[PDB]
Design a protein around this ligand. Sequence first.
Ligand SMILES: *[C@@H]1O[C@H](CO)[C@@H](O[C@@H]2O[C@H](CO)[C@@H](O[C@@H]3O[C@H](CO)[C@@H](O)[C@H](O)[C@H]3NC(C)=O)[C@H](O)[C@H]2NC(C)=O)[C@H](O)[C@H]1NC(C)=O
Ligand SMILES: *[C@@H]1O[C@H](CO)[C@@H](O[C@@H]2O[C@H](CO)[C@@H](O[C@@H]3O[C@H](CO)[C@@H](O)[C@H](O)[C@H]3NC(C)=O)[C@H](O)[C@H]2NC(C)=O)[C@H](O)[C@H]1NC(C)=O
Ligand SMILES: *[C@@H]1O[C@H](CO)[C@@H](O[C@@H]2O[C@H](CO)[C@@H](O)[C@H](O)[C@H]2NC(C)=O)[C@H](O)[C@H]1NC(C)=O
Ligand SMILES: *[C@@H]1O[C@H](CO)[C@@H](O[C@@H]2O[C@H](CO)[C@@H](O)[C@H](O)[C@H]2NC(C)=O)[C@H](O)[C@H]1NC(C)=O
Ligand SMILES: *[C@@H]1O[C@H](CO)[C@@H](O[C@@H]2O[C@H](CO)[C@@H](O)[C@H](O)[C@H]2NC(C)=O)[C@H](O)[C@H]1NC(C)=O
Ligand SMILES: *[C@@H]1O[C@H](CO)[C@@H](O)[C@H](O)[C@H]1NC(C)=O
Ligand SMILES: *[C@@H]1O[C@H](CO)[C@@H](O)[C@H](O)[C@H]1NC(C)=O
Ligand SMILES: *[C@@H]1O[C@H](CO)[C@@H](O)[C@H](O)[C@H]1NC(C)=O
Ligand SMILES: [Zn+2]
Length: 875
Amino acid sequence: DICPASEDESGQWKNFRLPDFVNPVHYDLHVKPLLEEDTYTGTVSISINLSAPTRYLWLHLRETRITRLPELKRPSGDQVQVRRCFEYKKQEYVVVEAEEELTPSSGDGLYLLTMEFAGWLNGSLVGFYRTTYTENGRVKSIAATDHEPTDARKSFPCFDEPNKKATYTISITHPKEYGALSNMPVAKEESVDDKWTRTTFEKSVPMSTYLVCFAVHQFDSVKRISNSGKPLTIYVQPEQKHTAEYAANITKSVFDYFEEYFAMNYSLPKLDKIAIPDFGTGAMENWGLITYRETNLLYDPKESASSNQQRVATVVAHELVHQWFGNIVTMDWWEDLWLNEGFASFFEFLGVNHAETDWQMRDQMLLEDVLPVQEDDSLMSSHPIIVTVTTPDEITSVFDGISYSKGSSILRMLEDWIKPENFQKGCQMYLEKYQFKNAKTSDFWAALEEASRLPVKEVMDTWTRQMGYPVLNVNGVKNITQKRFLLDPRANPSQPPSDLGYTWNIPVKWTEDNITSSVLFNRSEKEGITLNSGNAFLKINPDHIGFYRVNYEVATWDSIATALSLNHKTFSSADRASLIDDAFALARAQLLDYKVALNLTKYLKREENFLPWQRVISAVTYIISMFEDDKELYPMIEEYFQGQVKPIADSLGWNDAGDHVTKLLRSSVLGFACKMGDREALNNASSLFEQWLNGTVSLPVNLRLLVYRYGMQNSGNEISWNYTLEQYQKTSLAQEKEKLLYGLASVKNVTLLSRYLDLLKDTNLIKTQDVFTVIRYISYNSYGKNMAWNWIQLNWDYLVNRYTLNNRNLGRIVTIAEPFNTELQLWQMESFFAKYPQAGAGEKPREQVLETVKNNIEWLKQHRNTIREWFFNLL
Ligand SMILES: *[C@@H]1O[C@H](CO)[C@@H](O[C@@H]2O[C@H](CO)[C@@H](O[C@@H]3O[C@H](CO)[C@@H](O)[C@H](O)[C@H]3NC(C)=O)[C@H](O)[C@H]2NC(C)=O)[C@H](O)[C@H]1NC(C)=O
Ligand SMILES: *[C@@H]1O[C@H](CO)[C@@H](O[C@@H]2O[C@H](CO)[C@@H](O[C@@H]3O[C@H](CO)[C@@H](O)[C@H](O)[C@H]3NC(C)=O)[C@H](O)[C@H]2NC(C)=O)[C@H](O)[C@H]1NC(C)=O
Ligand SMILES: *[C@@H]1O[C@H](CO)[C@@H](O[C@@H]2O[C@H](CO)[C@@H](O)[C@H](O)[C@H]2NC(C)=O)[C@H](O)[C@H]1NC(C)=O
Ligand SMILES: *[C@@H]1O[C@H](CO)[C@@H](O[C@@H]2O[C@H](CO)[C@@H](O)[C@H](O)[C@H]2NC(C)=O)[C@H](O)[C@H]1NC(C)=O
Ligand SMILES: *[C@@H]1O[C@H](CO)[C@@H](O[C@@H]2O[C@H](CO)[C@@H](O)[C@H](O)[C@H]2NC(C)=O)[C@H](O)[C@H]1NC(C)=O
Ligand SMILES: *[C@@H]1O[C@H](CO)[C@@H](O)[C@H](O)[C@H]1NC(C)=O
Ligand SMILES: *[C@@H]1O[C@H](CO)[C@@H](O)[C@H](O)[C@H]1NC(C)=O
Ligand SMILES: *[C@@H]1O[C@H](CO)[C@@H](O)[C@H](O)[C@H]1NC(C)=O
Ligand SMILES: [Zn+2]
């Protein structure tokens, strides 16, 4: 009404990107929520540096509306007269036209634009919203913001691009029973009424809109003090207060570690963490006020698993990295998102490794990021680390494996090649140089290039400006050539067009008889290089440190299998995991005969280490899933792999004993035994489940999930299903809730799974943050595979209306179709996609899952007989 929508395209506001000549300096932001009404109002005053004559001023606004006609101030101070305001939907702008137009701000004086606005707190997990929880039987409220990447514009009108850094003075008018939090400490509190308080926070440092955060809450707190003398506090519901202890510890330890490591002071006087009871992502690095999903912050040593502990520590560490990489220095544009995400995904491991010494975190990088993303990045529908993005949907889509895991992986490779000391020094200089500003990828290379004088830009550009990665083909023992590695052998290796033509500058490392050497394999060496003793065996890519695969000659592979059977200890745990991982990915890609890959699994009865078992379980899970309905192959694959894990599963037992890594190993090894149909392992699960149903016995924390899953799967019925649902409602611990949700998804009953799916529409039962997690759990169920898939189709309009097409998790839900492997299923997918062609943030996930399912169909055609033969001849 006040700024009506107009389809007028004849202006600079038709451009997706904000103009270069309008820059903000300072935001004066005031909001007043009506919590019990799910509304808020506010006024924002923005000081503006203008660089070019313009009759229009525009900025981002979505959903929230302008209520008062905006008012502009000349740098002199005079009121600039306003003809109209209008909204431009196509590019999420509100535009105001001055009567005549005005000129640049030449000195230290600035324009001032103020606008009044009103928005909603309901039906959303982005912008500024309210959610509830129960305390001593009463329903309580908490309101908070979530902006990354393009949702600040929903909270309040702003210049909502990461490079438009400005300073912030925030105030909130809230009922007095509530506290108010933001990025900065409280400056002053003043009574509006005897019912209302105005909380004003001190001026911010220059920062991006996506980092701006405020909250209205009635939470208790757990407190700590950094070595800096600055308060680090975690806000938490009173009844959950005890579960904030571990996070508080790790925050302290990792905060102190990073500040020293980066040789730079944390820029704010305090740091707060808070878990919002319903929160749409894992966590968000809002400067000085980091928001969490409860599962990533709140941990109970008496009820939570080692897996949970590691998750909490890692996400906390992750969020802390951002206070330097992301917050102090921010990428200039979303195309360089990896400068934020990859860095956090890398340093999170260094942080947690400092806090928790015997966790082998450095090695766990292979399991968490390196090897999983080498799967992702072997698809044609991957994308380069530096990604062209032209819509909000495209922007949000790139918060993915490539930005996080491949980002992390190529930094891991870079560090090892360039040496840790120089990497560390180079990071510091980057952080010194671009503090409170924005950087491009080019800026980071130059920084490390100053610290090494090694050709960082020349080498790292090849890993950064094109998708994919190479396989090193071994001829002789030491001639290597490079070739792009693609899972689909039919795919055109030169597509999509790359200036670098899918060749890489590969820092190559290798071990000759316990001694290590290093060579940069140059792109221009078209016919390959030769590795510089009289050797009978060369170990290329130790600890899988380089982001590539090594395809040895078949004879070498055959010798490796034999060396593993004789004494697997000859190789390090990481090397074993890497060799197994490569071999199975190579077999999957039709670059190595499956018999050769499977031969590597023969030694496993003697395998006792975490890393190899994890990557074995990963490779087997795929193969088993492809033969799930094959009555001929399946029992043979089951029988064999059951036999291979049995010794280690039996040896570790059904009890929480040993160090961190052992406990993680026990979980995944017993899980695999159960998955492979080991009667005794299933009987342990059912026995413990039967005991848990008796209401007293608290299950061993690292066995719980397995007991809920396989217990429900093997002996669950309506009685125990209803009981489990009650327990899920009754527990305050989100980490327990989540396990119980997986339990509920495991019942072998169509009626009960149908009841479960219906609960997804009930916001009193399933939180908005948890809906996709549940759909995915149900999709893993032998009945639920098609149930979840059918349900998201039938309810697609409902989901789109609830979440919007800009929602990343909604875009991704189609990946529940990954196990599909028939022409019929592929046709179903294509038919559904054709019916709802507006994919939004699901555009890439759709491309990826289609490629996967097409690969699956081909894989079955190519390998069924070979794999059948290997198993038949063995058993
Ligand atoms: C939970 O899982 C355990 C396996 O991890 C089960 O424990 C096993 O039970 C088996 C059956 O009683 C035992 O079988 C005997 O094992 C010895 C090996 O030393 C063989 O020689 C025997 O031939 C074999 N059967 C006989 C003598 O008839 C296992 O030894 C035993 N223990 C282990 C460590 O494997 C638990 O039974 C199971 N718990 C529940 C509640 O089901
Ligand atoms: C790498 O994999 C190779 C291919 O699978 C292995 O070579 C095979 O070993 C099998 C052992 O299970 C042999 O199976 C036998 O096949 C004959 C039919 O020709 C059957 O009558 C036998 O009963 C059967 N053995 C059993 C136990 O049932 C294969 O014959 C054999 N194939 C060839 C061509 O050699 C290699 O052993 C393996 N290399 C390793 C482990 O280092
Ligand atoms: C939040 O709640 C308000 C009021 O309950 C919603 O506004 C109503 O939306 C319905 C359906 O679109 C309309 O029929 C009503 O006319 C609206 N009422 C008013 C006063 O606007 C609002 O849409 C909800 N917001 C979100 C994001 O779901
Ligand atoms: C957080 O750290 C504190 C203090 O650093 C831990 O408290 C110690 O726990 C150990 C073993 O439980 C005891 O022997 C000590 O007496 C405690 N105090 C100190 C100063 O060492 C606490 O366990 C940690 N929090 C967790 C695990 O969440
Ligand atoms: C398990 O839970 C359901 C749901 O609470 C129980 O109640 C029935 O649920 C159906 C839907 O499945 C409703 O149509 C009925 O109104 C419910 N009957 C009632 C409330 O009496 C069901 O009875 C429970 N079963 C067991 C064995 O506990
Ligand atoms: C203003 O916009 C420019 C766009 O180049 C950006 O780089 C800068 O960070 C913004 N803020 C300030 C305070 O200069
Ligand atoms: C490997 O390359 C070197 C140098 O080009 C050459 O001497 C040798 O013949 C090649 N082949 C093998 C199998 O070693
Ligand atoms: C599934 O659960 C329903 C509800 O209790 C029950 O009526 C039915 O017999 C069960 N069916 C199977 C196959 O277990
Ligand atoms: Zn992050």
